[PDB]
Amino acid sequence: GGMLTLIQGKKIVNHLRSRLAFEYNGQLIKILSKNIVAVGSLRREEKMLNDVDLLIIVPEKKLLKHVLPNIRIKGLSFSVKVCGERKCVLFIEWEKKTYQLDLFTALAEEKPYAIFHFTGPVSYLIRIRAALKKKNYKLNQYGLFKNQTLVPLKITTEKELIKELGFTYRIPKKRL
DNA sequence: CGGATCCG
DNA sequence: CGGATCCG
Ligand SMILES: [Mn+2]
């Protein structure tokens, strides 16, 4: 995959917002734009992008086996590099060039944890998770855990989650 | 099928 | 830090 400018990345994301679907028992089901979240370095507003990352919120657990393994993009030709229920890396054709598109899935209850994780950057997440680890927690893209048991937090949004964990909220571009 | 190498 | 996917 080639490099994208921030503007080029946003044009691709806007194009894909209405064009993602998946096959379920032989029927095409379109993914709702509200269930597609730009994440990764594009969400952090980096000037150049190595790839475009999209998080797909899956409303029902029964569909995880179906969404990414049967993912479809209207119009654009693409190839599958790797694909499973949780991560699918595609090489898409866009204006006569090939780019890397990373798709990730989160279930509804995981959404703020997934937004936090997939926004990154890695260095930011490592220091936050290291701090929680010393207090006997484990943080991942699925939830907050203590002794491998989910700790349910009274939060809905990524912002609420970051503050409930004990950290000041930073806008994505300022996370480092 | 698991060490290697991806993903944030 | 923590997790996902598959080449070999
Ligand atoms: Mn990325």
Residue numbers in the entry: -1 to 174
Question: What wording appears in the published article?
Answer:
In contrast, when using DNA-II (with 3′-OH) and dNTP (dGTP, dGTPαSe-I, or dGTPαSe-II), the DNA extension reaction took place to form DNApost, and the phosphodiester bond was formed (the after-reaction state, with the bond formation), followed by solving the absolute configuration of the Se-atom-modified P-center on DNApost in the product complex (the product-template–polymerase complex: nat-dG_pro, dGSe-I_pro, or dGSe-II_pro). In detail, we designed the crystallization trials with dGTP and dGTPαSe to form the products (DNApost: 5′-CGGATCC-dG-3′ and 5′-CGGATCC-dG(Se)-3′) from a self-complementary primer (5′-CGGATCC-3′) with one overhang 5′-dC-nucleotide. The 3′-OH attacked the incoming dGTP or dGTPαSe diastereomers in the crystallization conditions, thereby generating DNApost and forming the native and Se-modified product complexes. In the determined structures, the clear 2Fo-Fc electron-density maps and polder maps indicated that the three dNTPs were individually incorporated into the three DNApost products. The determined overall structures reached the atomic resolution, and the P-center configurations of these three product complexes (nat-dG_pro, dGSe-I_pro, and dGSe-II_pro) were solved as well. Though one nat-dG_pro complex and two dGSe_pro complexes belonged to P212121 and P21 space groups, respectively, their structures with the polymerase were virtually identical, especially the two dGSe_pro structures (RMSD: 0.2 Å). On the other hand, all three product-complex structures captured the reaction state at the post-polymerization level successfully.
